[PDB]
């Protein structure tokens, strides 16, 4: 059964609600982005209208085989009427094709559903500038002040400089980057660009990337692993055993691996600066965990919410324990008392 924080009152709509069967009263199912916890349940047998971005619709059609007649892509930053209700899709600064959804209810209420997002001051100059928001369905993944991490730009600077130094010292070093979902493509694209290489990967991952509308992508990626000195591998293989096994397969072309694991936050963020990050090393293999986040830090989340000034907040992450719920509610009240709304 579909939980309350996935339902939009006064409409026939749900958000990210595909794992509950036929939801009673739902006339249109919105999908914010192509991550498995959110799409859980979609397939070629789905026969209701799905509303989403262009990029998410390319992924539904090619990767899950949802039929075309049930895919309804909407352009971003554009007022659209869906089943008699005005909606707008906004870029969520999460993975490719991820949106937030503004719903203008028939009674005058305005609701913002963030989906998953990484808040940014640039959102303060979107179509959100123009009207009041009564209710905020908020991605609370990192809603506690311990959750700090650097900008995406600092993280990429670190990765490019680390990879270029290692391969210039040793032209026989291979770089490997882990992945298990869409998102974080800048990590492997930026490293391949500095090295003058295409990125090599499996046919299954190439297919996924080909759905993303990335400019000049045919110039950046390949399935010919032999031509490439940046390889993508499943995240599960980014360990000393999996990397050893991969280096054997490369036919003595290489004698060293440098590997990257983009994680979200890890407790090593509470002590160490990005500049000071060091790898784990065994022999000729070194693994870096890099804190490349596609979710808001605590401070980015707090700034956005204090700017938006919603009348009510409904968390969509960390909802399963009383302790998490009580912690999140305390921060929401602090924010409101400090800013005066
Ligand atoms: Ni996500």
Curated annotation (Swiss-Prot):
Tissue specificity annotation: Expressed in brain, heart, kidney, liver, pancreas, placenta and skeletal muscle.
Name of the protein described by the UniProt record: DNA cross-link repair 1A protein
Homology family: Belongs to the DNA repair metallo-beta-lactamase (DRMBL) family.
Shown residues within the full chain: 700 to 1040 of 1040
Compartments (UniProt record): Nucleus
Phenotype for residue 139 to N: Impaired nuclear focus formation, reduced interaction with PIAS and increased sensitivity to cisplatin
Induction context: During mitosis. The mRNA encoding this protein contains an internal ribosome entry site (IRES) in its 5'-UTR. This 5'-UTR generally suppresses translation while specifically promoting expression during mitosis, when cap-dependent translation may be impaired.
Stated role: May be required for DNA interstrand cross-link repair. Also required for checkpoint mediated cell cycle arrest in early prophase in response to mitotic spindle poisons. Possesses beta-lactamase activity, catalyzing the hydrolysis of penicillin G and nitrocefin. Exhibits no activity towards other beta-lactam antibiotic classes including cephalosporins (cefotaxime) and carbapenems (imipenem).
Oligomeric and partner information: Binds constitutively to TP53BP1. Binds CDC27, which is itself a component of the anaphase promoting complex (APC). Binds PIAS1.
